[PDB]
Ligand binder design. Structure first.
Ligand SMILES: C=CC(C)(C)OC[C@H]1O[C@H](O[C@@H]2C3=C([C@H](C)COC(C)=O)C[C@H](O)[C@]3(C)/C=C3/[C@@H](COC)CC[C@H]3[C@@H](C)[C@H]2O)[C@H](O)[C@@H](OC(C)=O)[C@@H]1O
Ligand SMILES: C=CC(C)(C)OC[C@H]1O[C@H](O[C@@H]2C3=C([C@H](C)COC(C)=O)C[C@H](O)[C@]3(C)/C=C3/[C@@H](COC)CC[C@H]3[C@@H](C)[C@H]2O)[C@H](O)[C@@H](OC(C)=O)[C@@H]1O
Ligand SMILES: [Cl-]
Ligand SMILES: [Cl-]
Ligand SMILES: [Mg+2]
Ligand SMILES: [Mg+2]
Ligand SMILES: [Mg+2]
Ligand SMILES: [Mg+2]
Lengths: 5, 235, 235, 5
């Protein structure tokens, strides 16, 4: 799970 | 447009109501109508737009990944054979691409060319990059490279403006850097660039923290924590 | 119907795929097409139908309650005045009523009259009661009493069949009893009847447990636990 | 929160 915003 | 007969302010109010009810498709429709009214968006309004479409397309992406994993399993060795999985994955994918095209059409007509301040211009270019990245996640044909390059170009223009017009701890600059790093890692097959960008972003923000007041940057420390999560996962 | 050109089996397969992806609106559309094929549904297929529409209308109900609470607050003493809240609550409510009408139309055309076995007949009558109850939750005009009575009548016919044709621990009978108790408590303003029904249902199921094999009733003990939760909340 | 199923 790559963190994006 | 189905919203052409509703007041801009009423559309904004109903977008906030939809946000409270977690009705993100309605939120997206309302903010689309608001945008199509033709006036630029305030800081609070851009946030509503981005949040609505981000949640809609996030649900779409999660469903697409479930279906794509099932499809991959169905094409392994010893897997029993119909076309239903492919068809339904294509359905979800086509709807996803429709939403992405809608957002990009909004940005191109005419949010970006009227965006003159750094905050808004960087916001919109980051969003352009995000949605071209979402298109890249599912691309498999003769357009993959051009979609990837469109994402890169939007992200890079946003980066150049944020580095020059924004402080290192600006939440928009930090979120742009996070998402551009994720682009490098997961789309561009450039994990070293992703790691370098994440680390440099985090270090510069860390060094600039001392200029901020406390209760006025929750989002910035939040996004610095996300950068650190990605760094921990990738190294 | 948009699904009239897809094979029944393909619709079932895609409903399962949509369930896995938590795309419940697609699941509902697929199971609607399957039903409209004209053949009765197997035990597994009824479950898919009920799950899909239950999740869709559950999201709709939660949004309606958020908006209705906001509306009530906006009509209190000292609250600052437009029509937007009422309009958007009405929008969500109208869409909700549309979904409920669709499910009831399916049950009436022609699932219930062809349902001859106790399992399926009780299943469909419980669902009829559930969706008339959902309509009752939002009713405010000259039809409220008739909607409430339609819910009661469906629930009662299902109860009479389940008591006579099903054992006390049957998951369908237990779920019917749970939902009829919730009808009494929250719709019919009959909390004592709700409590009595919940307690009697739980006690009879408890006394019949000794006839069951272990791994073959997870749902029944689950629903007995829900009955006990409601009893704890109401007393 | 009334429990239903
Ligand atoms: C409640 C209404 C809205 C505006 C929709 O959301 C509130 C949020 O909106 C703002 O936060 C933005 C923002 C988010 C913050 C990172 C969340 O911060 C916390 C602690 O909750 C997430 C949102 O998605 C949003 C709007 C997205 C953007 C993102 C957009 O790219 C195109 C770039 C980075 C980020 C920026 C714009 C954030 O400043 C505010 O600065 C935040 O104020 C607080 C309490 O930290 C608030 O959480
Ligand atoms: C995964 C596919 C489907 C079939 C959609 O859902 C699986 C579930 O479907 C069945 O469970 C039903 C059922 C549920 C069970 C109570 C859940 O049990 C557990 C431990 O998870 C919830 C569902 O909504 C469903 C289908 C609804 C009905 C409900 C319908 O009224 C019109 C009446 C009571 C309940 C009955 C039909 C349950 O038997 C099975 O008996 C369950 O088997 C197990 C592991 O307990 C399985 O959980
Ligand atoms: Cl499909
Ligand atoms: Cl509305
Ligand atoms: Mg495709
Ligand atoms: Mg500046
Ligand atoms: Mg109404
Ligand atoms: Mg029997």
């Amino acid at each position: 799970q790559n963190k994006s915003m | 447009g189905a919203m052409g007969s509703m007041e801009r302010a009423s559309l904004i109010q109903k977008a906030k109501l939809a946000e409270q009810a977690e009705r993100y498709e309605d939120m997206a429709a309302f903010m689309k109508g608001a945008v199509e009214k033709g006036e630029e968006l305030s800081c609070e309004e851009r946030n509503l737009l981005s949040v609505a479409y981000k949640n809609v397309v996030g649900g779409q992406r999660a469903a697409w990944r479930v279906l794509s994993s099932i499809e991959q399993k169905s094409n392994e060795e010893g897997s029993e054979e119909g076309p239903e999985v492919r068809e339904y994955r294509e359905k979800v994918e086509t709807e996803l691409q429709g939403v992405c095209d809608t957002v990009l059409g909004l940005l191109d007509s005419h949010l970006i060319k009227e965006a003159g301040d750094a905050e808004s211009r960087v916001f919109y270019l980051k969003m352009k990059g995000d949605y071209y990245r979402y298109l890249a996640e599912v691309a498999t044909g003769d357009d993959k490279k051009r979609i990837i390059d469109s994402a890169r170009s939007a992200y890079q223009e946003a980066m150049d403006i944020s580095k020059k017009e924004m402080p290192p701890t600006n939440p928009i600059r930090l979120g742009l850097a996070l998402n551009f790093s994720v682009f490098h890692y997961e789309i561009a097959n450039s994990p070293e660039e992703a790691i370098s960008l994440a680390k440099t972003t985090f270090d510069e923000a860390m060094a600039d923290l001392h200029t901020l007041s406390e209760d006025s940057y929750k989002d910035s420390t939040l996004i610095m924590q996300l950068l650190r999560d990605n760094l921990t996962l990738w190294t």
